[PDB]
């Protein structure tokens, strides 16, 4: 299913058909994307369960060498990092950066705190480690100077905001999909009715609520105007 | 998501669209920032859980050498401290001061009470310790005279008030974001629906309540005016 199908299921269950509606499809996209993460956390944070392939998304990154702090000689070894800021992953699935082949390569996505200290083990000096810095970028670290030649990677994870990760998908075979509405929404079909009814309950009450509808330099809501 | 998206989600669910509304967006910012800390404490103070990267913020500090009390010779060794007052961190995440490189440096953020007594261990004489004094400033302490050359640090933590810490973020690559509304709100997507419904419940009742709406040198509320 696509963003369009879910959006219009919500709009039609609310019957927000007219162009002169207070609640536009943008409200629906926002609520759907937030309730997706809400449900995914409620389902897959208590105890460890199998996560379906539907919850995952591959964002698609270009890496650039950057200094550790600045261009100084003693500021430490340099890192690669993604050109653009990366979405925050949720901590429930199998995050993975891979070199355009999911079935190949060993690039490890770890925590920020762990990545301060990695690679000291002599047998772990050739492993590339990844983590999202507080800057918002995905940083890479390794003790093997070869890692600085890496140009492109794909990052597959259950990203915390589906819209951000959908804007950064890799090109499909046909080509890029400009409209987010034509892209696929990242959630399992078993969790679609819960998500829809939560969003419809969210917007049902506000749908029929009054407005400050007179232009009289006055607040008209206490009068149910 | 930004402050703008959350603010207008709340305003639209309350339908506070007219400029002549009693409850402005400022009320919404205040309530959102307080309910964020409320929820973050309710979720992550009972027992220790993983905190997502979304709850964190990096404020960005300039340090200055200051005397311990005054300029006297016997008043003890001097400290560095941030030029401006620092927000209070909540005690739930991984507070960290770092030297413009999250993956490098060892500057320890500890409690005020502990920092009275640190560094006596001969192997811990070169560790820089941080704590927010009751003055409101972040103070630094070490037995290594080299620490007094430190000029700049970044402090990444789950700050207790998101607005204060958003005013003090480091510059982005593009540049500073003047409007708070254009900045990112520091909360995980799974906790956004709870926060929104708490704020909307907070302001739903008051939205429709009466006013002392006549100018007659009289209190008009007992009459539901």
């Amino acid at each position: 299913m696509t963003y369009n199908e879910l959006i219009y299921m919500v709009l039609d269950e609310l019957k927000l058909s007219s162009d002169d509606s207070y609640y536009t499809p943008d409200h629906v996209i926002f609520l759907l994307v937030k309730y997706r993460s809400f449900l995914l956390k409620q389902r897959y944070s208590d105890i460890k369960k199998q996560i379906p392939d539907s919850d995952y998304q591959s964002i698609c990154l270009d890496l650039i060498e950057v200094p550790a702090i600045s261009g100084e000689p003693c500021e430490g070894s340099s890192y690669l990092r993604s050109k653009n800021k990366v979405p925050t992953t949720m901590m429930i699935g199998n995050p993975r950066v891979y070199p355009m082949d999911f079935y190949q390569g060993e690039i490890t996505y770890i925590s920020r705190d762990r990545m301060r200290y990695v690679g000291y083990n002599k047998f772990l000096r050739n492993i590339i480690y990844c983590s999202k810095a507080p800057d918002g970028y995905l940083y890479f670290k390794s003790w093997n100077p070869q890692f600085l030649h890496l140009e492109k990677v794909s990052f597959n994870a259950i990203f915390e905001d589906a819209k951000e990760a959908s804007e950064m998908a890799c090109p499909e075979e046909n080509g890029t999909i400009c409209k987010l509405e034509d892209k696929e929404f990242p959630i399992e079909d078993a969790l679609v009715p819960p998500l829809i009814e939560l969003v419809v309950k969210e917007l049902r009450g506000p749908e029929y609520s009054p407005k400050d509808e007179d232009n009289n330099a006055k607040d008209d809501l206490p009068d149910a105007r | 998501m930004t402050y703008n998206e959350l603010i207008y989600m709340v305003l639209d669910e309350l339908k506070l669209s007219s400029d002549d509304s009693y409850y402005t967006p400022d009320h919404v910012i205040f309530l959102l920032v307080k309910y964020r800390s409320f929820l973050l404490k309710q979720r992550y103070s009972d027992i220790k859980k993983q905190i997502p990267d979304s709850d964190y913020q990096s404020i960005c500090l300039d340090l200055i050498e200051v005397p311990a009390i005054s300029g006297e010779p016997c008043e003890g060794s001097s400290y560095l401290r941030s030029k401006n007052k620092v927000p209070t961190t909540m005690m739930i995440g991984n507070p960290r001061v770092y030297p413009m490189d999250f993956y490098q440096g060892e500057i320890t953020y500890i409690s005020r009470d502990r920092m009275r007594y640190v560094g006596y261990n001969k192997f811990l004489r070169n560790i820089i310790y941080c704590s927010k004094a009751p003055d409101g400033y972040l103070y630094f302490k070490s037995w290594n005279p080299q620490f007094l050359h430190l000029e700049k640090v970044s402090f990444n933590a789950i700050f207790e008030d998101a607005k204060e810490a958003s005013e003090m973020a480091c510059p982005e690559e593009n540049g500073t974001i003047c409007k708070l509304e254009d900045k990112e709100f520091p909360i995980e997507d799974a906790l956004v629906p709870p926060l929104i419904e708490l704020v909307v419940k907070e302001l739903r009742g008051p939205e429709y309540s009466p006013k002392d709406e006549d100018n007659n040198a009289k209190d008009d509320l007992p009459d539901a005016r």
Partner: peptide
């Protein structure tokens, strides 16, 4: 009006708690 954010998660939490009790009564 209605909204199921806090209601859903409290119900889920209750079910998780009786979940843990049930599994904690399990013995090999």
């Amino acid at each position: 009006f209605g909204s199921g954010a806090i209601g859903y998660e409290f119900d889920n939490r209750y079910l998780n708690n009786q979940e843990m009790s049930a599994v904690a009564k399990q013995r090999l």
